[PDB]
Each structure stands twice: as structure tokens, then as C-alpha cells.
């Protein structure tokens, strides 16, 4: 029902749609019917998959971490031993979702998290342990865990989720930005200072997730990998940007490595070759 | 009669005429507007100092010489020393502004060359060292002079490769941002009207740059034989619909 | 208790499912939507914007000269450029069209190809921009080129030609990955008369090539891009 091309015959005219001036900064919406003779075709196509709700709205792996279940006797900090592990939530650590999101400078979405835990015993196990993971959403200002079993994991006001390893978690988080959107990019600082960090802002702060195994320990050591999957939903995006050409180097920075390979592919031949 | 290449822009007591122009760009088709009550969170009554700040401020002229990589300005930063607008920018905690950016480069009918004049909302710059290295405040805030993309890398400064747009994205893809061309056979001016583009309704004008103006030579400047191999590029920026909020003492920025 | 039977795929996490889930923050009231300019609803909006093609990708490094198609003065009948129309590869791979195309498997519809002339206003040229549809080779003598879809471009006060590459395909969709069955054909520019420069000017003048999509453009079956890659996870 939507027309793709219209029927157009031979034109011999002074109204020339295909000569324009791109110094104006505009793309003139020149049809194929404007410079060849066309037939009536129909679209049969709405465009529902290139919508930004569908584009940014499928689950991407955003974080992979290790926690362990072992005997915590004499371990000092319990964080280097990976008895727990917290993660400052961002969509910039793993670059596939990042290049999709850095196509805009402002994005606002409800978040959906799917947290998968897989276990592995790399040595000396008589059985596979049936473990429970606590994933505690820790907003900034909440007490961070220092032990795998301290008072912070009571989570009286922190949202927390328990799930078995091998099983997965799923919970949604609303848009928790301070601003009306998240800043994918921030040409600025937190304050006027000669040494403060550039670009890193709390305008894309989304909280933090602390992860521990609720089980005590066995004889053997269990390595539990936790994979966080983020699906954006109710996506609103603003200011389309140039796509990232160069490899990323850091979270929250537009930096690229020195001496990097050329991103434009060189031809085999001249500019005349096909 | 209705000449699309002859325009006049009057803002305040300042007027720019052009006779060799393209059509002006209004970024994302939004004209600048004041902050409405439905979007406002700050409860202060804002000051709207209309003719004294919403007027053209001509920057220092850049010389385009055949090997010029480009220039980058930061708004509101390139107007931080400009009249009453610069003073309200440092005496207030909050401020929002749209802009009419007008970039000027005249030549003859014998000259060739093309300038990408592009406005990039929140052009977060890349450090030239890579890693987690930050760009220092004084390099992201160079004022009227702007960033010369033909200059060398400095310690704490941004990367100045014009092909990667100082941010890791290719040069040809800047045309998704609201842009014009000063192609010397066609126009000598580029006019871009910028609205206030931010995820907050009003913002600090000293810690944050809303947009960047990049004037980038795409096709190199070819002068005719016997001409000086140099064209001046003059950038004239006017604030538009400028609010200021949260009046206190004058803030002290670095340098 | 309702008797239920549990089907295959129970407990699976398909990453493209769109279901409901419990909110970790009950009664949370998010920040209001203020008006931000430039709102994007659909990626078919922004690929209709023209972006520069790095069509002179004949250099060992990426620079501004990759975007500059050189013209030369005393040249009759010759070729200006040539390219195949695999829009997810080659000169198109890094353009905004070609980057969003690489998030999708199939494409359809017409391409908008622009050339901006940049030489002096007292210069002149006539060029012929040819689209060769598939099944034939890339044209080699301008006589082979004007047998296909072509625009003769007289260069004057309007510095930009807009050529369409019309959708010349038997199959309804083409792969964005280069596939030989579903190749789009070839694009080439040729000297239609020549480039005449004015006195006291010499050398090469340049063309700027642009690519965008016509409004009949289609994209489907979202997939990952081969553009960006990663070895270790990034940190702050």
C-alpha cells in the first residue's frame, strides 16, 4: 500500500531535481523516479526492525566477572581472592553494545538485566556444587561489601537477587539517570579543575552490582563466572553521531590506541578499478 | 528578488550580511527557545539579558594555508571572554544558550577548496596517549583561539588527527551532525543556528561544552598562480535565547 | 493450582525475547523527559543523510585525501573513478550508510550517490556518472558505461549532482555482506567532455562523493558488525 517508486516517463524539463547544492548541509530527497524512468513498486515494508526500540533493545553481554567459592580463612581483603566482586554498571566495557549506543549522544531506556552464572571446578572435585549467587544492586552511597559475608549483604534497602548457578537471573531496572537521558558522550568535567577527569561523568551512572556466592565452601574450589546481559527497553535516542571507527581503549573515553591500523580499506588497484 | 544567497542576520546591535551564501542550517530543525516551565527544575528566576549578550562576537581569524588540518571551537567556551556574555557565564552557576554560528571565508572565482563547517553536540575529545588518559581542562577550554588541529600533541592535550575527528570516528561521517560546506566556488559563508542541546534543562557553562564548532578543510586550498597561499577564516558566533541562573560570585576556572 | 505442562525452551535465555520482568526498583519515579532536539526513532531516518565516501582509498594511511576524487585537465573519454556497489565493503564500509548497513543482513531499495564539484568557479567540466547493473562487468571505455544507467553531469552554478542507483535486482533483497549472487553492480564516473581550468590556475580539482539511501531503502535481520572487535574487556 505504501509506494516505493512511482511511474515516471520521459522528462525534458527545467525543473531539475538531481542538481542541487550540498553546501547547504542538506540531503535532497531525490527519488529514483527523478532521474530514470520508473515503474510503480510498493514497499511491503514498514521499517520495524531498524527502529531504535528494536536496534538497541536486545540483550547484549555487558560484563563477565569471576567469583569463587572457597574457604575464607586468613584471606585479608576477600576481593582480590574473588570471594565477592562488584561491578560498576556500564555499557562501555564490552564494545559491541557500545558501538550501537555511541551512535547517539543521549539515550534513555529502562534496563533489563539477565545475569547468568556458570560453575566450573578446575581441580580435585568429587561433585559439582549446587550454589546460590547473590547479585546485590548497590547504588552510589550504599555501603560496599568488604567481606563476602558482612552486614552489607543483608540488603535491607538495596535490591538483591538470589539465583542458582546454571540458572539465570532476570530483573528490570528503570531509567536511573540523573538527567533526562544518559550521556553517551560528555564534553566536560565534574567541576572546574586543572586535574579532574574528562568525559567520565555520573550522567551515565547506572549503579553497581556486587556478586557473591551465598554458600560457605566445600573441600574443592568452585569458579563461578557471572555474565551480565543488558537489554535496553523503552528506548529514546537523540543526536545521531558518527560511528566509531577505531578500537576503544577505555570505559567512558573516546580514546583510541596509538599506531592503530587504518580503518578505511585500501584498494587493490587505482581509484578507477572495481 | 527572493535571493537565497543574500541574507542578513541581525542580533542585538550586530548585523551580518552575506551575498554568497548557502541556505542556513537550523540544527535538527529546532530553532532556539527559552526553557519552558514544563522542563525546568531549577526554581530560580532566570536572567535573560537579551540585546547585550545575544549578539555577534567575532573571534580571532584563522589563516587557512594549504596544509591546514582544521580548527575546533567549544561553545560556550569560545565566548567566555566576550563582553557581557562572558561575564554572565562566570557570575552564574547555570546557563543555557543557543547559537548562530557564522563562518566566513571569501576568495575569488579562481580559488578552489572546501571547508566542512560542522557543529558536533558534546564532542568529547580523545587523548593522544590512549589508555585511560584524560584531556586536561585548559586544552578542552582554549577560548576564542580554539584548538588548532594542525598543531602538535601536548601533554594532557587532545589528539589532533583530523581524519579521526579527535574522537575515534571518521571524518566523512561528520555529515550526520548539522553542517555546511564553504565550497569556494559556491558560497563564502556558512550559517548554522544551534539550539540548546543537552540532557539537562540548564547547565554549568564552565565545566561543560555543549557543542563544538569544527571548521575542517576537506578539499585543500588551491590558490591561483601569483596569489598568496592563504585565506583568512573568520568565525562569528552569536548567543541566542540565552538564560542565566544562579547568580553568585565570579567563578575561578584554571588558567 | 492450575495444571500446567512445561514446554521445550523453558529456562532458556533467548537474548531477543521481549517479555516482562520484575522491577528491582519498585515505586521509582524516573527523571522527567525534557525536550532534547534531534530525536531518532528509526535508523532509516539517518541513513538518508549523505556522508562522504572515502573513494580515493589508494593510500597506506587514512587521511582527508581518501575522500578527494581527483580530476585532471587534459583528459578526454577517460575514467574518473570506479567502484563495485558492495555497500558493506570497500569504499562504502566506513560510511554512515555502510556502517548501519553492516548491522543488518539484507538490504533493498535505491542508493543516493552525490558528487560535489570543488574546483574554481571559472572552471568547467562535464562528467558522466554510470551505474552498471549486475550480470555485466565493470565498464572499461565510457561506451560500455553509458549503455547502463547514467547521468551526464554538467558542472555549473550548482556544484552537486545527485545520482540514484536504482534498485535493479531480480531478488527482492541483497546481502550486505559481499555475495556474488546478489552483487549490486558497478559505479563509475567518466570524462564526458573534459575538465577545463581557467587561466592562472593549474593542477587537480577534486570531487567529493556522498552516499545515502533513498526513502525506499530496506534493512532487515539484525546482526553483529565486523567493524568493531575486542580482545580484553575495557576498564575505567
Amino acid at each position, epitope marked *: 500500500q505504501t509506494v516505493a517508486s512511482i511511474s515516471s516517463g520521459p522528462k525534458h524539463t527545467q525543473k531539475v531535481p538531481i542538481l542541487t547544492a550540498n553546501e547547504t548541509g542538506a540531503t535532497m530527497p531525490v527519488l529514483p523516479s527523478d532521474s530514470i524512468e520508473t515503474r510503480t513498486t510498493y514497499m511491503h515494508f514498514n521499517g520495524s526492525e531498524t527502529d531504535v526500540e528494536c536496534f538497541l533493545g536486545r540483550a547484549a553481554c555487558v560484563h563477565v566477572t569471576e567469583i569463587q567459592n572457597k574457604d575464607a580463612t586468613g584471606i585479608d581483603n576477600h576481593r582480590e581472592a574473588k570471594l565477592f566482586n562488584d561491578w560498576k554498571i556500564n555499557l562501555s566495557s564490552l564494545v559491541q553494545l557500545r558501538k550501537k549506543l555511541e551512535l547517539f549522544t543521549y539515550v534513555r531506556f529502562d534496563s533489563e538485566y539477565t545475569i547468568l552464572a556458570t560453575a566450573s571446578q578446575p581441580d580435585s572435585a568429587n561433585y559439582s556444587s549446587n550454589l546460590v549467587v547473590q547479585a546485590m544492586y548497590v547504588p552510589p552511597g550504599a555501603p560496599n561489601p568488604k567481606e563476602w559475608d558482612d552486614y552489607t549483604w543483608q540488603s535491607a534497602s538495596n535490591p538483591s537477587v538470589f539465583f542458582k548457578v546454571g540458572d539465570t537471573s532476570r530483573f528490570s531496572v528503570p531509567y536511573v539517570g540523573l538527567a533526562s537521558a544518559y550521556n553517551c558522550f560528555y564534553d566536560g568535567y565534574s567541576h572546574d579543575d586543572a586535574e579532574t577527569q574528562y568525559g567520565i561523568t555520573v550522567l551515565n551512572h547506572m549503579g553497581s552490582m556486587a556478586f557473591r556466592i551465598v554458600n560457605e565452601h566445600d573441600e574443592h574450589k568452585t569458579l563461578v563466572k557471572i555474565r551480565v546481559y543488558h537489554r535496553a527497553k523503552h528506548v529514546e535516542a537523540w543526536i545521531p553521531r558518527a560511528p566509531r571507527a577505531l578500537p576503544y581503549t577505555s570505559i567512558g573515553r573516546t580514546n583510541y590506541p596509538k599506531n592503530t591500523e587504518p580503518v578505511i580499506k585500501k584498494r587493490k588497484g*587505482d*581509484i578507477k578499478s572495481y | 528578488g527572493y535571493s537565497d544567497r543574500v541574507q542578513q542576520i541581525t542580533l542585538g546591535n550586530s548585523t551580518i550580511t552575506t551575498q554568497e551564501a548557502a541556505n542556513a542550517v537550523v540544527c535538527y530543525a529546532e530553532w532556539p527557545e527559552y526553557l519552558p516551565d514544563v522542563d525546568a527544575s531549577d526554581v530560580n528566576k532566570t536572567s535573560k539579558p537579551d540585546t547585550s549578550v545575544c549578539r555577534f562576537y567575532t573571534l580571532d581569524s584563522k589563516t587557512w594555508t*594549504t596544509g591546514s588540518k582544521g580548527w575546533c571551537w567549544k561553545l560556550p567556551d569560545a565566548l567566555k571572554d566576550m563582553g557581557v556574555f562572558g561575564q554572565n557565564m562566570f557570575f552564574h552557576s547555570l546557563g543555557r544558550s543557543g547559537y548562530t554560528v557564522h563562518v566566513q571565508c571569501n576568495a575569488t572565482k579562481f580559488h578552489s577548496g572546501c571547508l566542512l563547517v560542522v557543529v558536533i553536540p558534546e564532542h568529547q575529545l580523545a587523548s593522544h596517549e590512549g589508555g585511560n588518559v584524560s584531556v586536561k581542562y585548559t586544552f578542552t577550554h582554549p577560548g576564542e583561539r580554539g584548538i588548532d588541529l594542525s598543531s602538535a600533541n601536548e601533554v594532557g592535550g587532545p589528539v589532533k588527527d583530523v581524519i579521526y575527528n579527535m574522537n575515534g570516528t571518521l571524518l566523512g561521517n561528520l555529515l550526520i551532525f548539522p553542517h555546511q560546506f564553504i565550497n569556494l566556488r559556491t558560497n563564502n559563508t556558512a550559517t548554522i543556528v544551534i539550539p540548546y542541546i543537552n540532557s539537562v534543562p540548564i547547565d554549568s557553562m564552565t565545566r561543560h561544552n555543549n557543542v563544538s564548532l569544527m571548521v575542517i578543510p576537506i578539499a*585543500p586550498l588551491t590558490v591561483p598562480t601569483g596569489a598568496t597561499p592563504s585565506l583568512p577564516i573568520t568565525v562569528t558566533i552569536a548567543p541566542m535565547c540565552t538564560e542565566f541562573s544562579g547568580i553568585r560570585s565570579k567563578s575561578i576556572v584554571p588558567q | 493450582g492450575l495444571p500446567t505442562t512445561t514446554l521445550p525452551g523453558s529456562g532458556q535465555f533467548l537474548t531477543t525475547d521481549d517479555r516482562q520482568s520484575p522491577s528491582a526498583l519498585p515505586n521509582y519515579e524516573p527523571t522527567p523527559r525534557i525536550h532534547i532536539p534531534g530525536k531518532v526513532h528509526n535508523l532509516l531516518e539517518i541513513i538518508q543523510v549523505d556522508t562522504l565516501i572515502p573513494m580515493n582509498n589508494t*593510500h*597506506t594511511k587514512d587521511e582527508v*585525501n581518501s575522500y578527494l576524487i581527483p580530476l585532471n585537465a*587534459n583528459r578526454q573519454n577517460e*575514467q574518473v573513478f570506479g567502484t563495485n556497489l558492495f555497500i558493506g565493503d570497500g569504499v562504502f564500509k566506513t560510511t554512515l550508510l555502510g556502517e548501519i548497513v553492516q548491522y543488518y543482513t539484507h538490504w533493498s531499495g535505491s542508493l543516493r550517490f552525490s558528487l560535489m564539484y570543488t574546483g574554481p568557479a571559472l572552471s568547467s567540466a562535464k562528467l558522466i556518472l554510470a551505474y552498471t547493473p549486475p550480470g555485466a562487468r565493470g565498464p572499461q571505455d565510457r561506451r560500455e558505461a553509458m549503455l547502463g544507467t547514467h547521468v551526464v553531469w554538467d558542472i555549473g552554478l550548482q556544484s552537486t549532482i545527485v545520482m540514484t542507483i536504482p534498485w535493479t535486482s531480480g531478488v527482492q533483497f541483497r546481502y550486505t555482506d559481499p555475495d556474488t549472487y546478489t552483487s549490486a553492480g558497478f559505479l563509475s564516473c567518466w570524462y564526458q567532455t573534459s575538465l577545463i581550468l581557467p587561466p592562472e590556475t593549474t*593542477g587537480q580539482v577534486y570531487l567529493l562523493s556522498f552516499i545515502s539511501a533513498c526513502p525506499d531503502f530496506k534493512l532487515r535481520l539484525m546482526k553483529d558488525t565486523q567493524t568493531i572487535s575486542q580482545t580484553v574487556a575495557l576498564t575505567e
Partner: antibody, heavy 116, light 107 residues
Framework: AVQLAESGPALVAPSQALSITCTVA????????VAWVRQPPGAGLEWLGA???????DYNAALKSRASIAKDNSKSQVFLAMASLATADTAAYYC??????????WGQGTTVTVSA | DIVLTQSPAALSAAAGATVAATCRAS??????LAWYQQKAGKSPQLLVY???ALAAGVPSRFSGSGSGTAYALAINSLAADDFGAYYC?????????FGGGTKLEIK
């Protein structure tokens, strides 16, 4: 394999007409230009001229009124012709192929000595 | 017409050393400049086209640099293969004039 074979008389009296052929293999003259460059022994390279990929010729600004370049597309041959030979024309005459508009794929050349 | 000034006429050097030949131009070449090497009794061989980009099979110790009117061919860690006359030619705006040439003698 791109090959350009120069073929001349290699010994010619002065005040005569010179003629070098550049036999072309591996490409067509309709698609690539051919440049001519000489080198007298000891002295450096001098660009003689170029015939472009369709017929149009550009010449050395000193030698334009005596040099002439033609070609034959169907025979894949390029014809450098020189008139009124001086003893400064004693050189190794090379032919090239247009390579991104630069000169490349140089032949072995022909030593052409102008003497009596 | 553009006249290329190539400097110097000769440099006597040894292997491992670093050699820079410089080509100046009367007019702006816009990087449309080529570098040729030539061994004794051989055809000239294009090393660096477009004033910075190495040609096919040219080893990675040659490096062209410069823009505008000043162009410099630098050799980092010169080897035994790298001896002979070197030439600069511009390919901006026919006539495509050469430089004067630069010899390299074994020290």
C-alpha cells in the same frame, strides 16, 4: 604480468626523425596512460611526455615543438616520435604506465644514440 | 611550470646509517609527488608515491614525508640494496618535471 617493451632504432643520424615504440602487455591502452622519460648517461631523468588513457597528450615544455606521442590501442603500441635530433637526445628512452597518475612499470629502455 | 629542486647532489654514507634526501618545489604539489630509485644500469623504480606512501614491495625502511612544497625522503637503517641515484618527480599539473637527482656512494 604488466610489461612495457621499448623498441627503437638505437642509432640515428642527427637532423632526422626518431621513432620509439612501447609494446604493451598485461593491460590495455584505453584504460591506462603511458609516460615517456629519458635519461642521458650521467645526467638525471627528464620527463618527455605522456599520452593519456584516451588520446590526449601532454608534453615536456621545452620539447613540445619537436616531440609527439601517439598510440594504437588495437595493436597495444605507443609511438614516441621526435624530430630534429640534437646530440642531447642521446639517452635511454623509457616508457611507463599510469599508476594512480604516477609513473610506474618502467621498461628496460632503449639506448638511442644520435651520432654521425 | 613547476621546477623541482632536489638536494643534495650526492651523499656518501655507509650501511646502517640514516639518509635524508630533500626535494623542494617552486609551486604547491599537494602531495602529488613520487620518489624513484635507480641502481646502475637499471630502470627507475618507484619507491614512494603520493609523497608518503610506499609502493608495492618497497621495504619498510624507506619513508616519505613532507607536504606543500618541501618533500623529504628518509631512509632509516640504510642497507646494501639502497645505493644508487634517487629522483623526485611531481605528478601535479603536467609537465611532470623531475628533480636534479641524488647519488649515494658507499663510504
Amino acid at each position: 604480468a604488466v610489461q612495457l617493451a621499448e623498441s627503437g632504432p638505437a642509432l640515428v643520424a642527427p637532423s632526422q626523425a626518431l621513432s620509439i615504440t612501447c609494446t604493451v602487455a598485461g593491460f590495455s591502452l584505453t584504460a591506462y596512460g603511458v609516460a615517456w622519460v629519458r635519461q642521458p648517461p650521467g645526467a638525471g631523468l627528464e620527463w618527455l611526455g605522456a599520452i593519456w588513457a584516451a588520446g590526449a597528450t601532454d608534453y615536456n615544455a621545452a620539447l613540445k615543438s619537436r616531440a609527439s606521442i601517439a598510440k594504437d590501442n588495437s595493436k597495444s603500441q605507443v609511438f614516441l616520435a621526435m624530430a630534429s635530433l640534437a646530440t642531447a637526445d642521446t639517452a635511454a628512452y623509457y616508457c611507463a604506465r599510469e599508476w594512480d597518475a604516477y609513473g610506474d612499470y618502467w621498461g628496460q629502455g632503449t639506448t638511442v644514440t644520435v651520432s654521425a | 611550470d613547476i621546477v623541482l629542486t632536489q638536494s643534495p647532489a650526492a651523499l656518501s654514507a655507509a650501511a646502517g646509517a640514516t639518509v635524508a634526501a630533500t626535494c623542494r618545489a617552486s609551486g604547491n604539489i599537494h602531495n602529488a609527488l613520487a620518489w624513484y630509485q635507480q641502481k646502475a644500469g637499471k630502470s627507475p623504480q618507484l619507491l614512494v608515491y603520493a609523497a608518503a606512501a610506499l609502493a608495492a614491495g618497497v621495504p619498510s625502511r624507506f619513508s616519505g614525508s613532507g607536504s606543500g612544497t618541501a618533500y623529504a625522503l628518509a631512509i632509516n637503517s640504510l642497507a646494501a640494496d639502497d645505493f644508487g641515484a634517487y629522483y623526485c618527480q611531481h605528478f601535479w599539473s603536467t609537465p611532470y618535471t623531475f628533480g636534479g637527482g641524488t647519488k649515494l656512494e658507499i663510504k
